[PDB]
Amino acid sequence: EFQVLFVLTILTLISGTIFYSTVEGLRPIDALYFSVVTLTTVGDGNFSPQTDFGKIFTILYIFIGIGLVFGFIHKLAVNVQLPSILSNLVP
Amino acid sequence: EFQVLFVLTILTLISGTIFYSTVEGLRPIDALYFSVVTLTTVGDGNFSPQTDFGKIFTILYIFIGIGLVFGFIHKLAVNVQLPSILSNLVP
Amino acid sequence: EFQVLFVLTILTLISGTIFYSTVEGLRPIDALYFSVVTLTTVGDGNFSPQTDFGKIFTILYIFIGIGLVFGFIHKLAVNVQLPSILSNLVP
Amino acid sequence: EFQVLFVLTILTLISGTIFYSTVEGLRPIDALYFSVVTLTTVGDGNFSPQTDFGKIFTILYIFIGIGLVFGFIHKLAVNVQLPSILSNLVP
Numbered sequence: 026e027f028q029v030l031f032v033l034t035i036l037t038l039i040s041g042t043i044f045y046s047t048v049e050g051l052r053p054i055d056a057l058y059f060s061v062v063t064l065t066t067v068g069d070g071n072f073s074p075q076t077d078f079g080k081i082f083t084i085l086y087i088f089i090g091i092g093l094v095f096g097f098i099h100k101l102a103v104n105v106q107l108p109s110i111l112s113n114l115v116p
Numbered sequence: 117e118f119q120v121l122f123v124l125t126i127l128t129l130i131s132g133t134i135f136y137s138t139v140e141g142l143r144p145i146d147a148l149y150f151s152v153v154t155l156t157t158v159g160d161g162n163f164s165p166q167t168d169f170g171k172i173f174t175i176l177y178i179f180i181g182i183g184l185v186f187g188f189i190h191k192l193a194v195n196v197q198l199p200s201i202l203s204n205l206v207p
Numbered sequence: 208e209f210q211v212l213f214v215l216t217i218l219t220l221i222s223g224t225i226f227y228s229t230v231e232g233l234r235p236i237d238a239l240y241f242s243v244v245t246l247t248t249v250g251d252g253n254f255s256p257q258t259d260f261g262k263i264f265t266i267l268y269i270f271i272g273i274g275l276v277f278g279f280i281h282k283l284a285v286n287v288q289l290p291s292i293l294s295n296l297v298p
Numbered sequence: 299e300f301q302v303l304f305v306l307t308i309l310t311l312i313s314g315t316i317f318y319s320t321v322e323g324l325r326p327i328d329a330l331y332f333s334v335v336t337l338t339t340v341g342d343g344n345f346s347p348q349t350d351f352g353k354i355f356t357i358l359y360i361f362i363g364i365g366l367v368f369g370f371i372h373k374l375a376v377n378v379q380l381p382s383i384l385s386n387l388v389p
């Protein structure tokens with residue numbers, strides 16, 4: 026479960042990285058950063074896509090990727106972080 | 117369910133698109149982009165409504181539209197994305 | 208329930224409005240706008256508090272107000288929006 | 299529970315404060331502010347990490363810290379705010 030969610034998140038992020046570095050001309054790391062803050066709904070305070078293609082893609086990217094990214098964060102904290110803490114609270 | 121949620125989301129987004137392109141003078145695609153990043157809580161890093169009418173509308177737009185948009189994203193991933201993946205994990 | 212949540216949200220927003228218009232010198236409507244986009248986690252693309260007092264308050268404002276604001280949005284859509292739609296889907 | 303969540307949130311925020319004030323050169327209060335608005339997904343409208351180290355850290359910081367921060371906000375409102383209000387609604 027966590028593995029599949031992990032793999033799906035990676036693939037989604039790779040897709041955004043390729044798109045923004047190609048269409049919006051961002052350096053790869055910046056495209057990855059934008060993809061991450063966008064899907065986690067944190068938001069980027071400086072960059073906004075400048076092309077109409079970038080705007081449409083971002084809109085679709087958001088609706089399709091948010092559910093996945095949060096499903097991953099949800100399990101990452103509940104089934105991988107909670108225990109390491111919970112079992113650690115045991116005297 | 118997913119259909120109704122889909123239709124309701126579209127109508128909400130169309131409303132924002134019309135409002136911002138008319139009151140804030142944004143190009144239609146930009147008004148749609150702003151409506152989308154606002155309701156998904158991602159946020160726009162460059163634009164903020166400039167008129168008092170735009171600010172009040174955005175405030176009300178947020179409170180009324182967030183619940184809907186996320187109800188749609190929730191089902192879009194759970195009742196339309198999960199299966200295509202779940203049934204796909206079956207050897 | 209919805210009434211109490213409504214009243215609590217209003218009081219929280221009034222507090223932010225007074226704080227930002229006084230300490231950060233924002234026009235009242237702008238202080239209200241900032242308070243709203245901050246507590247709904249949408250975020251403001253142009254303004255960030257400039258004083259250390261504004262930064263500390265915003266930090267505490269966020270932790271205390273997000274839960275409330277979303278509890279209100281949750282009920283606003285589930286116990287006030289769902290029905291108006293659900294009962295409306297009945298032929 | 300609330301205590302542990304509180305302590306874990308503090309440690310996470312201290313880590314971000316140290317990182318951004320050191321690598322991105324932000325004043326401590328600004329580093330704390332950025333760490334807070336980032337993990338609560340509110341977002342900062344003016345600052346974005348400028349170094350590649352800052353971008354990578356923020357990406358990892360987000361995935362690991364969001365779950366915790368919201369687990370804390372969830373309990374802060376449900377097991378510490380709800381009662382003070384609920385028991386207060388009793389005539």
Ligand SMILES: [Ba+2]
Nearest residue numbers: 070161252343
């Ligand atoms: Ba900006």
Ligand SMILES: [Ba+2]
Nearest residue numbers: 068159250341
């Ligand atoms: Ba945001």
Ligand SMILES: [K+]
Nearest residue numbers: 066157248339
């Ligand atoms: K958000």
Ligand SMILES: [K+]
Nearest residue numbers: 068159250341
């Ligand atoms: K934002």
Ligand SMILES: [K+]
Nearest residue numbers: 068159250341
């Ligand atoms: K922003």
